[PDB]
Amino acid sequence: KLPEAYAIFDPLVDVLPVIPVLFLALAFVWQAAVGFR
Amino acid sequence: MTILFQLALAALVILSFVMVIGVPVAYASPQDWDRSKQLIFLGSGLWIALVLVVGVLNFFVV
Amino acid sequence: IAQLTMIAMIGIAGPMIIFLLAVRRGNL
Amino acid sequence: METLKITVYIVVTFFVLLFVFGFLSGDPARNPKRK
Amino acid sequence: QEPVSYPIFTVRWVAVHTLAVPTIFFLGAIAAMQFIQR
Amino acid sequence: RDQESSGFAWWAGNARLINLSGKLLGAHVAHAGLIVFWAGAMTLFELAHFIPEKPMYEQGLILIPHIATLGWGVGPGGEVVDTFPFFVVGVVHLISSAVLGFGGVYHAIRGPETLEEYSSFFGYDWKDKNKMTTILGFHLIVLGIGALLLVAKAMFFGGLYDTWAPGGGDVRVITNPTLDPRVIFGYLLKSPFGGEGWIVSVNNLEDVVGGHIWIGLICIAGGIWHILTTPFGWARRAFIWSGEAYLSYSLGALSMMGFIATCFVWFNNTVYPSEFYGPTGPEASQAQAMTFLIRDQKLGANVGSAQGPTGLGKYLMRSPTGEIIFGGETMRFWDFRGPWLEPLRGPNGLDLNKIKNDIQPWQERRAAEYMTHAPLGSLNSVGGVATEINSVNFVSPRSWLATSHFVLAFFFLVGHLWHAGRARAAAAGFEKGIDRESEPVLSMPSLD
Amino acid sequence: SANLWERFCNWVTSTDNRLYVGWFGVIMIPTLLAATICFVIAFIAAPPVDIDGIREPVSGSLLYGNNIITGAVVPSSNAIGLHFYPIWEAASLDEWLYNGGPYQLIIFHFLLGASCYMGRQWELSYRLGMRPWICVAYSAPLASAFAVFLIYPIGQGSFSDGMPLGISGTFNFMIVFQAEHNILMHPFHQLGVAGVFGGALFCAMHGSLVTSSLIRETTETESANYGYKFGQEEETYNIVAAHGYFGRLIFQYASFNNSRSLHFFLAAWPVVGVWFTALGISTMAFNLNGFNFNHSVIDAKGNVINTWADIINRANLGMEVMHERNAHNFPLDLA
Amino acid sequence: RPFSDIITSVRYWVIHSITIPALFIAGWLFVSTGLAYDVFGTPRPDSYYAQEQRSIPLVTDRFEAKQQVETFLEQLK
Amino acid sequence: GWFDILDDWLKRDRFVFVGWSGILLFPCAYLALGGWLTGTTFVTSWYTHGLASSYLEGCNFLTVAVSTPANSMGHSLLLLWGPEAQGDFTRWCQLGGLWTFIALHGAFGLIGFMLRQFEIARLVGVRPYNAIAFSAPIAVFVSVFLIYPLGQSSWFFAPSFGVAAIFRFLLFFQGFHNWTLNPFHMMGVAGVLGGALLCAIHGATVENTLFQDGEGASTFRAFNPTQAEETYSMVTANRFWSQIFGIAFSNKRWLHFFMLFVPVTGLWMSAIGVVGLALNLRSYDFISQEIRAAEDPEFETFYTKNLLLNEGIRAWMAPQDQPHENFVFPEEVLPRGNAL
Ligand code: CLA
Ligand code: CLA
Ligand code: CLA
Ligand code: CLA
Ligand code: CLA
Ligand code: CLA
Ligand SMILES: CC(C)=CCC/C(C)=C/CC/C(C)=C/CC/C(C)=C/CC/C(C)=C/CC/C(C)=C/CC/C(C)=C/CC/C(C)=C/CC/C(C)=C/CC1=CC(=O)C(C)=C(C)C1=O
Ligand SMILES: CC1=C(/C=C/C(C)=C/C=C/C(C)=C/C=C/C=C(C)/C=C/C=C(C)/C=C/C2=C(C)CCCC2(C)C)C(C)(C)CCC1
Ligand SMILES: CC1=C(/C=C/C(C)=C/C=C/C(C)=C/C=C/C=C(C)/C=C/C=C(C)/C=C/C2=C(C)CCCC2(C)C)C(C)(C)CCC1
Ligand SMILES: CC1=C(/C=C/C(C)=C/C=C/C(C)=C/C=C/C=C(C)/C=C/C=C(C)/C=C/C2=C(C)CCCC2(C)C)C(C)(C)CCC1
Ligand SMILES: CC1=C(/C=C/C(C)=C/C=C/C(C)=C/C=C/C=C(C)/C=C/C=C(C)/C=C/C2=C(C)CCCC2(C)C)C(C)(C)CCC1
Ligand SMILES: [Cl-]
Ligand SMILES: [Fe+3]
Ligand SMILES: [Mn+2]
DSSP, X not given: OOOTTGGGGXXXXXXXXXXXXXXXXXXXXXXXXXXXX | OHHHHHHXXXXXXXXXXXHHHHHHXXXXXXXXXXXXXHHXXXXXXXXXXXXXXXXHTTTTTO | XXXXXXXXXXXXXXXXXXXXXXXXXXXX | OHHHHHHHHHHHHHHXXXXXXXXXSXXXXXXXXXX | OOOSSOOSSOHHHHHXXXXXXXXXXXXXXXXXXXXXXX | OOSTTSSOOGGGGXXXXXXXXXXXXXXXXXXXXXXXHHHHHHHHHHHTTOOTTSOGGGTTOSSHHHHHHTTOSBOTTSOBSOOHHHHHHHHHHXXXXXXXXXXXXXXXXXXXXXXXXXXXXXXXXXXXXXXXXXXXXXXXXXXXXXXXHHHHHHHTSSOEEESSSTTSOEEEOOSOOOOOHHHXXXXXXXXXXXXXXXXXXXXXXXXXXXXXXXXHHHHHHHHHHHXXXXXXXXXXXXXXXXXXXXXXXXXXXXXXXXXXXXXXXXXXXXXXXXXXXXXXXXHHHHHHHHHHHHXXXXXXXXXXXXXXXTSSOSSEEEOSSOOEEEXXXXXXXXXXXXXTTGGGEEBXXXXXXXXXXXXXXXXXXXXXXXXXXXXXXXXXXXXXXXXXXXXXXXXXXXXXXXXXXXXXHHHXXXXXXXXXXXXXXXXXXXXXXXXSSOOGGGGSOOOO | OOOHHHHHHHHHTOSSSSSOOOTTHHHHHHHHHHHHHHHHHHHHHOOOEEOSSSSOEEOOOGGGTOOTTTOOBOOOOTTTTTOOOOGXXXXXXXXXXXXXXXXXXXXXXXXXXXXXXXXXXXXXXXXXXXXXXXXXXXXXXXXXXXXXXXXXXXHHTSGGGSOOBSHHHHHHHHXXXXXHHOGGGSHHHHHHHXXXXXXXXXXXXHHHHHHTSBOOOOOTTSOGGGGOOSSOSSOSXXXXXXXXXXXXXXXXXXXXXXXXXXXXXXXXXXXXXXXXXXXXXXXXXTTOBOOOOSOOEEOSSOOEEBOHHHHHHHHHHHHHHHSOOSOSOOSSOOX | OOHHHHSOOHHHXXXXXXXXXXXXXXXXXXXXTTOHHHHSOOOOTTOSOBTTBOSOOOOOXXXXXXXXXXXXXXXXX | OOHHHHHHHHSSOOSSOOHHHXXXXXXXXXXXXXXXXXXXXXXXXXXXXXXXXXXXXXXXXXXXXXXOXXXXXXXXXXXTTSTTTSSOHHHHHHTTHHHHHHHHHHHHHHHHHHHHHHHHHHHHTOOOHHHHHTHHHHHHHIIIIIIHHHHSSOGGGSOOBSHHHHHHHHHHHHHHHOGGGSHHHXXXXXXXXXXXXXXXXXXXXXXXXXXXXXXXXXXXXXXXXXOSSOSBOHHHHHHHHHHHTSOOOOOHHHHHHHHHHHHHHHHHHHHHHHHHHTTTOOOOOOHHHHHHHHHOTTOOOHHHHHHHHHHHHHHXXXXXXXXXXXXXXXXXXXXXXXXX
């Protein structure tokens, strides 16, 4: 699957693809924190 | 070599994490940002170094 | 040995950046 | 049935040409404001 | 708004509390159903 | 600036960047990082689950096949012999993403918010026509260089996976691409309707690499052209020069490209192979038919003059022209050309004699494997239509790509409608509503 | 004097015409006129059409003994496929009609014209110095018309699997569609019906709330509608009364008080809904099907217990077995 | 009156963090001890059939409906 | 005395109003909702049809229902204290007592809301058009959930509260009555799509003829709730629409009344349609077509395809959809397309 040395980071690799959607959520977090200008 | 390879790769993931929380508040905050210009420079220099020394060490392990 | 340690950390990584800029008041 | 192909092509072509020449002809100042 | 001569529990009180205790009791039961083997 | 002194609510916030160049630059060079990040992250995620002796289309890989088409990590017949190119492509994209994002956060928060007072070559104005044509010229040149990279891969660096090669596909090097404009522009004169087909009708990699040379150099010449030229009068009277008009045209372009892409990925099998993505739409029907014929022929039945329970053939039929094609409801597909089905096709459709004696093993097993794997599935990924039971799970990669790019294209069309309307209305100046005192209709003759 | 082009070009863009006719119009009008002629003639006096390419014609013409409900223009043949099939690619008009010729002839012109109509709406709004994006709202029925007449044929691979141009034929289309893909368990079709039911609902309650707040300029022998005298500078009801009515009905926070928000929302709900179901048909053309649950309840003996989804699957199997005359043997199909 | 006034007062927490876990646990224990199966009389997934009655139970009279279903439950189906 | 006290404590202004209608509305509505929520959660339908329809049995949210009573109950209401459960709660749950419970209590909750609308309108001092408009869903409710099972032999053929159980109703109606070919349903569908058509277009026209009164591109902030000056150019809307389509409103009062009129009438005409099916009077055939398809076997129309399909729906759904008949059909008498 992944070379045997990096195999330890098999969970780290599984959590990579959902990092993009979070940016769009963070932008709403940001906006509510400054109280919506 | 493989313990050293894991050790270097673990520090890279950690130092990327420390970098990804560190530089936005380094540029952004207004009550110190200009003193953090050397910290982010040395930090990013070490980052690209650490990346490439782990990279060449791949072929010497696997 | 836990590798769930970074999946813990990586979800709070975002708002901690904003939380501190809201402690250090400026440029949110 | 062969004449039919040619006269349909000519008709279609005539209309598409009026269309393009019509949109080249000064359309962004046809508005009632800022003409 | 709900009255200003203030009965001890008003009308808003029963409205939120007929919809508070069943759904807490229900999402505790529905969650338990998930761990039934089937 | 950054409150309601700008003329946009928070849900239109990105529109405060029409007049700030640096802040806008930071926004885009930061977003590029996301596109690259997903490329790398997704192929690493796919590879962590990849079984490299199981065909790619039955496990959901949709980024490894693009690399496989370039003939990296593959042997003959589309098997994996080593998995290193996958890892290196993914990890180097994921690493370069950081470099893009770094430039993002810097130009957005630390950089000058106006680049016209800073620089006069990164200083630009949407109403300055000359700057736009020069930037457009740069961008055409880096696209021209980008188009010649594939030609390099084709001729020097081990070529491409040719699926039309003898005995199933094999990686083959192009040693002679067409440089013949007649054949090249001939594709653009064909009718889009079934039977013929537009540029989608490509059937060999010589035309592909040849056309890549052709489009590359017309855009290097055109890119050089827009640095050394100022737009003409009729060109200036045909347009609205506004920072939003360019976006409208570009949305129009992207919606057209998505419609074309979803047509490609559904029908072609030269640039989207049959050994890295599953069979195509007609390919499974034709396969079912072909393996049925082969099975029933071994019992010694007459299949060559066999008439149905409605007549007009039982295994084979006549097309309109008179070629021997497949019968039943496989009579709407005979525009299908497969690599595996073509050695059996006579001078006017299939020749039943070639069927009896010139069956090679890989052909009949290709036909048999493609029969039970036809583009269907549900939105919770289990094979078949709504009558059959959940016991086999199939969703062609073709359907995922087709459905996604279709709905994104429809939405990019309606976005082009929106931004064209805003740009046109804002130009003339009634995009904030209709001025009270004077109104057009109050000065126009009343219909009766 | 001025030459004929300048005269023509301001005759076209004349916004003093009784009916507008743009540059989109000059290409809209012939295509739709032709569409109208071919529909009126073909619904009435067409010969029967071989649609299954095995010599069973279907009558859809009134003159060969149909009424309005059963009549239709019968789709192009399965033998013709996705081919372009005009009058001059046939050997005779006789056999062009035999292969469902007029069906293609109505729909190409009609879809083209319906897009040119979308263009014309924008042009008239641009000439009247009013806001755009009535044309953005028109993209919803238009995209559903495309999906049903052009995309779903490309996807299934023939124009026989189009929707006939008629009422009972439309019903036939729905019933075969449900059997072969089960559209009711597709979440997108569920948002489409929600948008239509909610759209109809918001129309009714909007109508009642505004007509119940009207001012008194009338008497009780002349209709209420003569309170508006055309193009009043006085809005003809009191928003805070309706707001105060709605605000006691559900609550104070469940009642809009900005007519501009109310009307934006009134326009936004069904349009998003109709997009979603139009796309739903379009993805089913590539054969991304609704959710299918076979046996969600099984016990310890390992024997199944039915669900309502199973009763629906039995019906689907019934319809689908009837829509297959092509043989008894069909193992993994479509298409 | 706004939720802001409700989300802060100590008496709100001193009731709630005490009542709600009891209700959560009352709801959990209600299904997990199998009591929901007896008070609603819903079968367990080993009691839909029996080894002498391999067809669906069906009521066919409306005044002995009660007795008919009690017969099916008495024979351990 | 005490009456006018009970009056002004009820009719008082509060975050949410109660009134005399509150006394009928709130218990009935709350019990009906609550019943459905416990029925979808714990209650089986295995002693009635041979289905599972609850989370306790393992079904998801797309396949649960509070299912109808059994066929042998007739049209009995099945009261808890009555001589079909005799003071017993468990059997009452098994026999489908919750369906009727929910149906009756929801039927009174509808009357409560209807009355509530009248009362609030009489109080605020506006005309009661919203309550007249709200009689269309009650017409539909009592025509589909009450009159239709009372015309048949039981509650068993009524729709069960649940999404998939309503889908099965759609297929049942199509299969046995050919419901789309009845003109009252044509009129209802038209009325409802026309309501939906008017919604999108009216919103789009008002929102795209707004005056300039703001400073930002968004015009949502240029509105004050007062009616002193007009908020959209009606004249412009008329001039636009009379030119692109040919006819236009030139009377607001009439436009809003047309908006009220189209879907409420649609639903009323459809209610007449489903009470027509309750006697099994159903538009299903045109006799001229049968005699013609009898004398000529190579005649085909789409209508004949629809009747063959109706055969398929019925013959294949009947076994598990009418278990109380204990139907058994051999595998050789089921209808088949390929046998034609
Ligand atoms: C692709 C390029 C592109 C670009 C660069 C722009 C740029 C812009 N648009 Mg445009 N637009 C586009 C495409 C594009 N658009 C398309 C394709 C459509 C059709 C929908 C539109 C429709 C549109 C409208 C209607 C409007 C704009 C407006 C704007 C401006 C402000 C936008 C803003 O702040 O939103 C900030 C964005 C949000 C608050 C949206 C957040 C969405 C969330 C919460 C959920 C997203 C879910 C996702 C779609 C589904 C998948 C999720 C996944 C996780 C599985 C800005 C200049 C505005 C303007 O001023 O126009 C002139 C305005 O009114 N745009
Ligand atoms: C990919 C999406 C995208 C991008 C690239 C941007 C970019 C930007 N937006 Mg937009 N926006 C977006 C989505 C996005 N936005 C969406 C979806 C919405 C809807 C809510 C908005 C709503 C919105 C509004 C209302 C406004 C903007 C504004 C801006 C600018 C803010 C600059 C600033 O001072 O930030 C300050 C912010 C911070 C200090 C906190 C965020 C921290 C950042 C920069 C990093 C986070 C990611 C990560 C951890 C960094 C790793 C670095 C590593 C590689 C080393 C900036 C150029 C503003 C604007 O136009 O002003 C002129 C403004 O008022 N945006
Ligand atoms: C692609 C988008 C893009 C654009 C348009 C810019 C534009 C700019 N950047 Mg940025 N930058 C980017 C991406 C981008 N950057 C990325 C990805 C990063 C992370 C590496 C950075 C990080 C960065 C920083 C931190 C700084 C700049 C600076 C500059 C400014 C330079 C002014 C000058 O006189 O330069 C004169 C220099 C040149 C004309 C030559 C540059 C040669 C280099 C550095 C790159 C060459 C790359 C490649 C090999 C080119 C191949 C071309 C090929 C066709 C043969 C300019 C406005 C500086 C500035 O003042 O910004 C305001 C500053 O502080 N850049
Ligand atoms: C002086 C010339 C010049 C040159 C050469 C470029 C070059 C580029 N610009 Mg550009 N730009 C210029 C001036 C210039 N800029 C000016 C005056 C402005 C106005 C401020 C901008 C504003 C601008 C913006 C805002 C953007 C660009 C983008 C781009 C990139 C397009 C990538 C692409 O097409 O992806 C497809 C890829 C290819 C065709 C393959 C490229 C192969 C070659 C030729 C380069 C590869 C090596 C190089 C170091 C880049 C590596 C990228 C990495 C992520 C892998 C490219 C690096 C965009 C971008 O991607 O930035 C992130 C973007 O958003 N430009
Ligand atoms: C792809 C990106 C791109 C973009 C955005 C532009 C943008 C522009 N170019 Mg340009 N150009 C490009 C690439 C690009 N160019 C390349 C790569 C070449 C080299 C081959 C050229 C060669 C070129 C020339 C020769 C000229 C421009 C000009 C212009 C301006 C045209 C003004 C106008 O109204 O034309 C509108 C044009 C038309 C309406 C006629 C179109 C005729 C054709 C191509 C199609 C007719 C429609 C037909 C039905 C389509 C059938 C397709 C079929 C296959 C189905 C505009 C600023 C002009 C200018 O002022 O430059 C300064 C000018 O003289 N361009
Ligand atoms: C105001 C709200 C209200 C209304 C209208 C009803 C209405 C109804 N309930 Mg319900 N119920 C309610 C509140 C309400 N209930 C509450 C709060 C509870 C919880 C305690 C229940 C619990 C309940 C259960 C469990 C059930 C019903 C059932 C029923 C129905 C059966 C008939 C019945 O009991 O009528 C209600 C009223 C009466 C029977 C009698 C009223 C008598 C009055 C007005 C005067 C009597 C005068 C005098 C003493 C007569 C003397 C005669 C003598 C001289 C011979 C009916 C639709 C059943 C059902 O739906 O089955 C399908 C059922 O299962 N009820
Ligand atoms: C050979 C041939 C051609 C044969 C014919 C084939 C064929 C099928 C014929 C059709 C016959 C057929 C079978 C009919 C069946 C159904 C039928 C009889 C239905 C009528 C009965 C009915 C349902 C009654 C009750 C419900 C009802 C009234 C429904 C009507 C629905 C309907 C279509 C409404 C109209 C919608 C519509 C398009 C409105 C546009 C209004 C408009 C001009 C708005 C613009 C506008 C908006 C503004 O906001 C403002 C401000 C202004 C100013 C303004 O202007
Ligand atoms: C270092 C590193 C890395 C990376 C990291 C990162 C990048 C992280 C992330 C970060 C981020 C990027 C994060 C984010 C976050 C976010 C979230 C998680 C979300 C949030 C939101 C929410 C949850 C919501 C909210 C709300 C509500 C609730 C209500 C309304 C309002 C609002 C919407 C606001 C990797 C992995 C490559 C590996 C190597 C190293
Ligand atoms: C502006 C803004 C924004 C946005 C932003 C963005 C868009 C950004 C992005 C950026 C980016 C785009 C980033 C990224 C990052 C990344 C990184 C930093 C990475 C790292 C990695 C590494 C280091 C690696 C490692 C490894 C290896 C090497 C191998 C194996 C695996 C692993 C993973 C372990 C928002 C809206 C939010 C807010 C407002 C403002
Ligand atoms: C062979 C081949 C190839 C290539 C090809 C080529 C060579 C292409 C070309 C392309 C092209 C060649 C394209 C074109 C396009 C075009 C367009 C898209 C259009 C334009 C125009 C317009 C858009 C216009 C507009 C207008 C009008 C019309 C009117 C007047 C006004 C205006 C301006 C508005 C490839 C690679 C695939 C490979 C394989 C094969
Ligand atoms: C039967 C009966 C009765 C009654 C009872 C009752 C009244 C009950 C109630 C109950 C209840 C009252 C319940 C409730 C529950 C609840 C629930 C079931 C909920 C759910 C929720 C959810 C699921 C959520 C979701 C969401 C949302 C909403 C938003 C967004 C986010 C989310 C998605 C998360 C009586 C005793 C009289 C008699 C006997 C019989
Ligand atoms: Cl059929
Ligand atoms: Fe209105
Ligand atoms: Mn079909």
